[PDB]
Amino acid sequence: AGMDVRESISLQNQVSMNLAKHVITTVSQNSNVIFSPASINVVLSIIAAGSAGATKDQILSFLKFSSTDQLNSFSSEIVSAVLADGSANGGPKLSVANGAWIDKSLSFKPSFKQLLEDSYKAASNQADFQSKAVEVIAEVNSWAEKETNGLITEVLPEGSADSMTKLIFANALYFKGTWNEKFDESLTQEGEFHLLDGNKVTAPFMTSKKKQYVSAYDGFKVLGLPYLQGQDKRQFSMYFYLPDANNGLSDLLDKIVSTPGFLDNHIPRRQVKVREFKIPKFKFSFGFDASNVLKGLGLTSPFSGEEGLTEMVESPEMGKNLCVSNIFHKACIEVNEEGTEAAAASAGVIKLRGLLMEEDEIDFVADHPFLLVVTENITGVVLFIGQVVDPLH
């Protein structure tokens, strides 16, 4: 067809929430999740580019773009700019690891290797999966560690690739940002978090008396926490989606998944007065092989010998029945008090106005499971989706 990048992104983000739903289905009740839909979609764009026929088409439709050219450009023009490190300019720190390895019984078309290098800044290599799978795993891990300056350490789990492994992708996204408004660490206090299994646990909750970006909706609330920008043009924020009910998470995610444009429509844009305001600290990483959940969402062709990836390698006999073995992804997230030390003080106009008006106050107390979304606000691109079901792990 033909379509605006804004609507592409809006469609993608909805599919991404359903992907998040399916990932959550594969972990235990109390397992935290964090992953980067953008990075996943970067891999799928790479795969589309090395494919054709019903396979190219199936991925094209999954990703909401009409051609491989559209994908390629959206990646290099938009996604990479969004995924670029911002620390040099005072914005958040981001680091990306992006690569493909194929059993050395094969070889990529030189042309494919250049596309990966140019539109994607992605490595491509051969490996001896057939006889040295254990070494290849360590090699890929060392490589990812090198690409992320030691930040991400183990994209492939032990025993994840073997003598049958033919084609893998390894992808990682590290992000660390300073809040636009620090929390006073002196105010952090222990408190009860209510687990989905019915039990409670004691955990550090941050608090504040400053005004917050919070909106209430039917059955849930949303909090936005902007990241310090510096000279970075991008504007990152983290959003918290908090069901009213302690066990409401699953239903809230069902609502999100079934409502087109949900994310575009639940962005709190006004700082309002909070009465009770509690945010649990948390810090964790999360990794998975995307191949199975994607098959679950019906994106089956890249992983089936049926069609294959005939535009990726050189031997048409090898390219026939060649498919993706694994898509290894790793992400990590952290929430603490750290905010900018360089803020200009506020004039206090709105505070003064409050001495003359009756401003309505609101609670946002995240003492139970909530969803997480990290987005770049200018493009609307989503860096991370996650769930915090247990702050202590």
Swiss-Prot record:
It is found in: Secreted, Extracellular space, Apoplast; Cytoplasm. Interacts with RD21A. Residues 339-363 are annotated as: RCL. Glycans are attached at residue 377. The record marks 353-354 as: Reactive bond. One of its GO terms (cellular component) is apoplast. It comes from Arabidopsis thaliana. InterPro entries: Serpin_CS, Serpin_dom, Serpin_fam, Serpin_sf, Serpin_sf_1, Serpin_sf_2. It holds the Pfam family Serpin. Changing residue 353 to A: Much less efficient in metacaspase-9 inhibition. GO terms for molecular function: cysteine-type endopeptidase inhibitor activity; serine-type endopeptidase inhibitor activity. It comes from the Eukaryota. This is Serpin-ZX. Coiled coil: none annotated.
